[PDB]
Subunit: 120 residues, 4 copies
């Protein structure tokens, strides 16, 4: 149920393939751009989740460098997939920027994204 | 400077290859076990970091399933590599477990790991 | 301003707070008497006038006269005024643990509070 | 118990706190007078007696008589007693933002506090 296209509340889109081995691969597009806003993503998911109605744990990373831009940053999303008629991926994320040592204390933003199969 | 073996304060070891394209691949071993405690990891890093003395942003994911165990969970680490004589990868992480909807509010642990090239 | 009163999150919890002129937040958090806990925090009592939210934070230690969970939650966020006022937060819930278990001491999450249930 | 007093973190900040019998934390955070801010929080005033830490949290809004950063930090953690006493924390720093910038409103980090600099 994970493979395909997902949309969050900020207008971002990612397109992921969930491999039988637990790999996540695909692309993440930040809301504003087209090709210039598309970045590689890779991650992992639980390919044998519980059958007790629990979600499926997963995570992925995007480094914000592509052939157009480099924001010297990387975001990781950690969350779970919840299936059904209104499938969701509920996540929390950490965005770390490369900083000097003096600024390391303010290197990392935290937030939360909810992804759905249809645009908000 | 990222490729190789790193150790954190909990006794965990990971071994990563940083690809020229920005890929991170390797294995993460939780402290206690041998093969039963080794898990696939994948991630991304900034393959063209700033040259102003800033760290190199990166992130990776481990899903805690292998051929021996499955904890129905996944951890993402977000941080930066800092080079030099005492190289470090400074991270913050999110560990999400698959949960029922009723328990989703307590699905995600947060913490921090510092990795060095030598065992603590 | 706009913060004093009763707030409700998505989980069905009730946050009753007084925002003092001095930047203090005081009140109670109900997550029945058994479920009511003291809260105290701080807010920016002179926020920007450029349309930005009002930064704030508070803590609940999960001990009252009835129960003790040996844990505490802190919420960090901002108040956003207007017709559909909100307090948008992220929180950290730390449990007392042994040193061996300290790596898994802290949960993270997010709550949105509104003025209506 | 063991919490009242002065604490120092790895960044050179100074945390001066009184832990009240009722579970209250009050004091000041210096991150000079210009750099001193009010703090208030809560702690578990009847912690477990099994070797677990004592859960606590506090907030500083970064406004004082000299400066206002339109932001607030909450620390969530636990006190660990003994010869080498510590308060181990993780924190959230939320800045007031526009709604457009709210996705990047909140920094996360960690501080360790000790009784000696
Ligand atoms: O794409 C990014 C990073 C996006 C982080 C998104 C975070 S991950 C967690 C959260 N979830 C999301 O879906 N989005 C956010 N930055 N790009 C921006 C740039 C930019 C432009 C050029 C360059 S450069 O060519 O390398 N250049 C810079 C220095 O001068 C010369 C070299 C680098 C960066 C400029 C402005 C804004 C962005 C940006 C910021 C936020 C988002 S967004 O997706 O968060 N956003 C969508 C629109 O509504 C607001 C939120 C997207 C792009
Ligand atoms: O390996 C894991 C998950 C590790 C999460 C580590 C987190 S990531 C963030 C932080 N950084 C680290 O390096 N470590 C921690 N769990 N395994 C444990 C199990 C276990 C055993 C069997 C199975 S099963 O076969 O699937 N089985 C379960 C149900 O019954 C039938 C099926 C599943 C899980 C049991 C006990 C403990 C662990 C565990 C927990 C913590 C760590 S640790 O690395 O955090 N740790 C090292 C030792 O000192 C304490 C900390 C390692 C393993
Ligand atoms: Ca930026
Ligand atoms: Ca467990």
């Amino acid at each position: 149920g994970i493979t395909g296209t997902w949309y969050n509340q900020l207008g971002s889109t990612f397109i992921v393939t969930a491999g039988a081995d637990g790999a996540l691969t695909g692309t993440y597009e930040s809301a504003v751009g087209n090709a210039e806003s598309r970045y590689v993503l890779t991650g992992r998911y639980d390919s044998a989740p519980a059958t007790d109605g629990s979600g499926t744990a997963l995570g992925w990373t995007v480094a914000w460098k592509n052939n157009y831009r480099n924001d010297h940053s990387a975001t990781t999303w950690s969350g779970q997939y919840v299936g059904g008629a209104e499938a969701r991926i509920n996540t929390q994320w950490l965005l770390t920027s490369g900083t000097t040592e003096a600024n390391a204390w303010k290197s990392t933003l935290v937030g939360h994204d909810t992804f759905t199969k249809v645009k908000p």
